């Protein structure tokens, strides 16, 4: 026998190298403005939901074909698939929980073979973004609520959970997690982490997890 563990990964800047919202902002012509808000939000200087709605509103009217062009530029972080496969090899459950968007996160869930995926969604009308976003990964304690929910479904004690992220919206996930790993993270999350990894290779987390 042997117990399973549950590992939750943030998406933007953690499982992938990019910030989905910033990539889309480039196609919408508001890259500078959105990048600045994203940085403040991930450093913990802004309420997450308010900052995300402010950024998504700047994307109003962008055609879906341009959103896809931005998504195409997203690349997986070094070692991502190998790390996920090794965790699954141990019999562990793996999830991605993101303040980003299904249109990007759906793909990685299937590509890397994840068991769960939670993200927000961009609202679309007549083939263009309306500027609205909706979802359950918006409130300040959203990720922690999701970690608890998944752990309950799987019968896994919170002490056997691991959270891996880079930004301030990963703090609520860290609060409930058994092991807190800040991956090439912002100072506000590093302060709360058990382990800080600065080499950009997800395989580095494996050493800390039995
Ligand atoms: Mg992130």
UniProtKB/Swiss-Prot annotation:
Protein's name in the database: Phosphoserine phosphatase
Functional pathway: Amino-acid biosynthesis; L-serine biosynthesis; L-serine from 3-phospho-D-glycerate: step 3/3
Keywords from the named record: Amino-acid biosynthesis, Hydrolase, Magnesium, Metal-binding, Serine biosynthesis
GO CC terms: cytoplasm
Free-text comment on the cofactor: Binds 1 Mg(2+) ion per subunit.
Residues at the catalytic site: 10 (nucleophile), 12 (proton donor)
Residues that bind substrate: 19, 55, 98-99, 143, 169
Similarity annotation: Belongs to the HAD-like hydrolase superfamily. SerB family.
Enzyme class name: hydrolase
EC nos: 3.1.3.3
Cofactor(s) in the UniProt record: Mg(2+)
Organism encoding this protein: Methanocaldococcus jannaschii (strain ATCC 43067 / DSM 2661 / JAL-1 / JCM 10045 / NBRC 100440) (Methanococcus jannaschii)
Lineage, broadest ranks: Archaea, Methanobacteriati, Methanobacteriota, Methanomada group, Methanococci
């Amino acid at each position: 026998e042997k117990k399973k563990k549950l590992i939750l990964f943030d998406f933007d800047s953690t499982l992938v190298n990019n910030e989905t919202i910033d990539e889309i902002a480039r196609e919408a012509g508001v890259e500078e403005e959105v990048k600045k808000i994203t940085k403040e939000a991930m450093e913990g200087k802004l309420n997450f939901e308010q900052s995300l709605r402010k950024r998504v509103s700047l994307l109003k009217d962008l055609p879906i074909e341009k959103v896809e062009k931005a998504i195409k530029r997203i690349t997986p972080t070094e070692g991502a698939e190998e790390t996920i496969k090794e965790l699954k090899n141990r019999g562990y459950v793996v999830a991605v929980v993101s303040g980003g968007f299904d249109i990007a996160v759906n793909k990685i869930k299937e590509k890397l073979g994840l068991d769960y995926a939670f993200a927000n969604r961009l609202i679309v009308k007549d083939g263009k973004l309306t500027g609205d976003v909706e979802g359950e990964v918006l409130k300040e304690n959203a990720k922690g609520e999701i970690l608890e929910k998944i752990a309950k479904i799987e019968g896994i004690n919170l002490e056997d959970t691991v959270a891996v992220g880079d930004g301030a919206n990963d703090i609520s996930m860290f609060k409930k997690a058994g092991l807190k790993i800040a991956f090439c993270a912002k100072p506000i999350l590093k302060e709360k982490a058990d382990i800080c990894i600065e080499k950009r290779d997800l395989r580095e987390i494996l050493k800390y997890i039995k």
